[PDB]
Design a protein around this ligand. Structure first.
Ligand SMILES: Nc1ncnc2c1ncn2[C@@H]1O[C@H](COP(=O)(O)OP(=O)(O)O)[C@@H](O)[C@H]1O
Ligand SMILES: Nc1ncnc2c1ncn2[C@@H]1O[C@H](COP(=O)(O)OP(=O)(O)O)[C@@H](O)[C@H]1O
Ligand code: SF4
Ligand code: SF4
Ligand SMILES: [Mg+2]
Ligand SMILES: [Mg+2]
Lengths: 274, 274
């Protein structure tokens, strides 16, 4: 078996930094992991690959002719800890549907046998500002059973978490896609941990970890690494190790309870963030 | 004549706060303005209307039967300064295309005569994390000639600005959609004004205004107002008045020059934000 997880959240919230660091910690533990980039920004694997980014399945298929002229061994790339990496890509802005590459990529990976029995985890790093087209496909088509939402005390980040949760509810009659937890990626604001705990409890889930804001992230990423690789002794490395451990041990996977805008505003008012 | 402007940018960057405050300042000057909300969050008019939000054209059409059973006089609502307000709405998460309501709304407004000769400005407040479907329609279909992008020294906000610019370039052979400027909505970081000026110059545009981060915004918005209405003497009110004046006087409307990821990273490295 293998655990199929998707990391969702609003743009810029920390999906790719959190996912790559979490996965590096899993590999450090001895887990075998694949990352599938499902964000048109297409830099979801650069810290594992020590790279600028990674050429996408949509780009590679265009240069080869069709996606069927591609070989899995040509597409998947291994980096830190043996973690395997692939990027979906997407059409250029103004053209088509921004999520269409996600559908092509996941179907290619399934057909070509990328989901080998030896994998322990697959993580999809998915744009979450809209829940439609290929960005909804991991939920609609039962590809990621465990959804973890990166968020913060930012109102927009909590709104996104609620919207993603509504998408999970919409498809709960089929498949087995569930909300596994919220990950708070701190803005260094007071009571932020308490705020995201409260939001998680209203949705029916949990705050699986509070990730501190730490400049070592920038120093590692300038060098194209995870903090796990850049400085294994860093306090922030231990934070990502704690998040990884709690993901491994997590057994709470729920159909969430989306909240009203009034509930969200009351959360913000109560914990004095605003 | 009337100037059709669209405010784009990544989620949470400050589109709706900036647009409503800018428009309040325009109304304070004596301009006649309409705001068209083109973001599924659907709270782009609440500060003009003193409201929780505004019921959307998609919601109202569903309750009436079809969009043709709606009357313009039933849909448009006037608030502070006589500013007229409408919200597009969008399908629920996981269903359809998140931008489909924008197409329905703009077409309804055009057909029903909302663009009366007495208007001086129309502002569309558009989700900009993806540039596709109805979110691309103001550009693709030549509805907003002047695009202003709200951004910040945040890498994700600059990436979004570049992506929106690529969409403008893609449709420059038809219509007259142009980039009018960048608006820096400050994160209170050093050299941020210089950073966004540099980005604007690389794209071929300008920083039309640097909006400071100011907590009076939160105090006004808790009370469902713009800063212009809440405290006309506030320093931040004068900031929005300066932005409004510069938008009125702006004559630079360009086909932008999108930059590479290397150029964006060099900007961040240079100005020491990272
Ligand atoms: N815990 C953290 N501490 C400091 N900086 C962070 C942290 N998490 C993310 N960042 C920074 O935030 C920015 C956006 O993160 P990223 O993972 O790229 O967001 P997303 O993938 O959600 O768009 C990056 O510059 C990253 O280095
Ligand atoms: N200049 C500013 N100073 C302080 N807070 C701001 C400023 N601009 C925006 N905000 C706050 O940022 C949050 C997001 O702004 P909003 O306009 O709703 O973003 P968007 O419409 O782009 O999603 C809101 O809580 C708003 O009050
Ligand atoms: S939102 Fe992107 S194409 Fe439907
Ligand atoms: S991205 Fe939303 S439907 Fe195409
Ligand atoms: Mg990312
Ligand atoms: Mg908004």
């Amino acid at each position: 078996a293998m655990r199929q997880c998707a990391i969702y959240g609003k743009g810029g919230i920390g999906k790719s930094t959190t996912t790559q660091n979490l996965v590096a910690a899993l590999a450090e533990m001895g887990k075998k992991v694949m990352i599938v980039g499902c964000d048109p920004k297409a830099d979801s694997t650069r810290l594992i690959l020590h790279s600028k980014a990674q050429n996408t399945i949509m780009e590679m298929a265009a240069e080869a002719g069709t996606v069927e002229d591609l070989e899995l061994e040509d597409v998947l790339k291994a980096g830190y800890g043996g973690v395997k990496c692939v990027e979906s890509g997407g059409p250029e802005p103004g053209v088509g549907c921004a999520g269409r590459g996600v559908i092509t990529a996941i179907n290619f990976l399934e057909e070509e046998g990328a989901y080998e029995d030896d994998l322990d985890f697959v993580f999809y790093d998915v744009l979450g500002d809209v829940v439609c087209g290929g960005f909804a496909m991991p939920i609609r088509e039962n590809k990621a059973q465990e959804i973890y939402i990166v968020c913060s005390g930012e109102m927009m980040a909590m709104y996104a978490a609620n919207n993603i949760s509504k998408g999970i509810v919409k498809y709960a009659n089929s498949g087995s896609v569930r909300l596994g937890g919220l990950i708070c990626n701190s803005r260094n604001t007071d009571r932020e941990d308490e705020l995201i705990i409260a939001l998680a409890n209203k949705l029916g889930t949990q705050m699986i970890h509070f990730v501190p804001r730490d400049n070592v992230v920038q120093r590692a990423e300038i060098r194209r690494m995870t903090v796990i690789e850049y400085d294994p002794k860093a306090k922030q490395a231990d934070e990502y190790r704690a998040l990884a451990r709690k993901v491994v041990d997590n057994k709470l996977l729920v159909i969430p309870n989306p909240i009203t805008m009034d509930e969200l505003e009351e959360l913000l008012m109560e914990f004095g963030i605003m």
